[PDB]
């Protein structure tokens, strides 16, 4: 069946109009899609907010507005506010069947963007004797809530044994994240070089050790 | 008010059976028409069945035709869904929601499903030191790798809980069917390593406690 898509992520500033789209791969979506969206917020709060194309629920604010536009669905917030940063999901019915989108998050600038702070940690003696080695990145305080992490071992970019949390919500209201390296004893030992990379906003903070 | 509650989930191992229920209140649960939906550990939203005001047409997608069933009790303003021959891909948050005129207004608070072999683990418990003398300033960070361990949650506490400004608790990764995860706390230079820091990690599920010194 249908691949729903919608952007991955979007920042806006509070105050101003945003739109976010919704896809389908089967060509054009029309008015017997019947095109919701749902709102999550943190603590999987599920919220829906328009359905049928463009008919709003009762209690959601007027800034919200949906629309088909050029053959996709979409959504409208009009003097987005800080209370807005939520993932926005979509849903397209397909004669009995709903199909959903991946999500887009939505952040609302509600203070001002913080680079990560990176800390790269060497396994420790006790893992080595199991035979393995965990190396960990921690990025914590940054905002915007997405980062890109790209891991080298002696220069040469990393494809295989990585896994990176996605990102969490902090009590300051910032994001943290942590990403793995999983080698074998052997493998650390037979390397000398190694980085954690983390992309944010455009700049790329390195943390590395031999 | 609107209220949906769903329950019955838990631990189940692939293969198994298990019933959801979603209980509602504050509105005629009778007229409307309703649906699960479920949200994947990555965090994908995946609809699973639909019934209609009166239960006569039911629909599923193709990957749950013929294990879940939906059915409804409109005597009890209770939504249930029979789940058979589970599958580790069935792990999930379960919600119910209502067809409100054709928005998916009102959402419960959805109940935890994991299906999986693994069995009760312990979580090994190593230190996170800087190592490399060559720190960056006034302030270290050290931290704690819980790997290994099955089923969720488990808590960190530092120092007992005397530590608490400037902890970070990561999420969990699924590594091999166990999760592991990572905690850190940055503490002023003066501090460590003249007095002592110590992870406290417990894991409820096997009833473990381990207490893991930073030493550097």
């Known amino acids: 069946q249908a691949v729903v898509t919608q952007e991955s992520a979007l920042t806006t500033s509070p105050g101003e109009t945003v739109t976010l789209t919704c896809r389908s791969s089967?060509?054009?979506?029309?008015?017997?899609?019947?095109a919701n969206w749902v709102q999550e917020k943190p603590d999987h709060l599920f919220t829906g907010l328009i359905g049928?194309?463009?008919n709003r629920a009762a209690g959601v604010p007027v800034r919200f507005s949906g629309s088909l536009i050029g053959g996709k669905a979409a959504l409208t917030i009009t003097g987005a506010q800080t209370e807005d940063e939520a993932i926005y999901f979509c849903?397209?019915?397909?004669?009995?069947?709903?199909?959903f989108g991946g999500g887009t998050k939505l952040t609302v600038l509600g203070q001002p963007k913080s680079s990560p702070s990176v800390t790269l940690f060497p396994p420790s003696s006790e893992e080595l004797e199991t035979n393995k080695a965990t190396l960990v990145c921690t990025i914590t305080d940054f905002y915007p809530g997405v980062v890109t992490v790209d891991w080298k071992v002696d220069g040469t970019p990393v494809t295989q044994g990585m896994e990176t949390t996605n990102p969490s919500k902090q009590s300051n209201n910032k994001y943290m994240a942590s990403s793995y390296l999983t080698l074998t004893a052997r493998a650390w030992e037979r390397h000398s070089s190694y980085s954690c990379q983390v992309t944010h906003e455009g700049h790329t903070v390195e943390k590395s050790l031999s | 008010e609107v209220q949906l509650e769903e329950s019955g989930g838990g631990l189940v191992t692939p293969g198994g059976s298990l019933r959801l229920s979603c209980a509602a209140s504050?509105?005629?649960?009778?007229?409307?028409?309703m649906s699960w939906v479920r949200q994947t550990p990555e965090k994908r939203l995946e609809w699973v069945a639909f019934?209609?005001?009166?239960?006569?047409?039911?629909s599923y997608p193709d990957t749950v035709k013929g294990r879940f069933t939906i059915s409804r009790d409109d005597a009890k303003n209770t939504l249930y869904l029979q789940m058979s021959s589970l599958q580790s891909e069935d792990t999930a948050m379960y919600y119910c929601?209502?067809?409100?005129?054709?928005?998916?207004?009102?959402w419960g608070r959805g109940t935890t499903l994991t299906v999986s072999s693994a069995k009760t683990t312990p979580p090994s418990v190593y230190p996170l030191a800087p190592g490399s003398a060559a720190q960056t300033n006034s302030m270290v960070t050290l931290g704690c790798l819980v790997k290994g361990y099955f089923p969720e949650p488990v808590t960190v506490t530092w120092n007992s809980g005397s530590l608490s400004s400037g902890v970070h608790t990561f999420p969990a990764v699924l590594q091999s069917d166990l999760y592991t995860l990572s905690s850190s706390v940055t503490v002023p230079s003066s501090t460590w390593p003249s007095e002592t820091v110590t992870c406290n990690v417990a894991h409820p599920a096997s009833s473990t406690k381990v207490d893991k010194k930073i030493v550097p």
């Open positions: 929601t209502r067809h409100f005129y054709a928005v998916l207004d009102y």
């Open positions: 504050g509105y005629v649960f009778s007229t409307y028409d």
């Open positions: 089967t060509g054009t979506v029309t008015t017997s899609n019947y």
């Open positions: 849903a397209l019915w397909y004669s009995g069947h709903w199909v």
């Open positions: 019934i209609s005001s009166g239960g006569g047409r039911t």
């Open positions: 049928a194309t463009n």
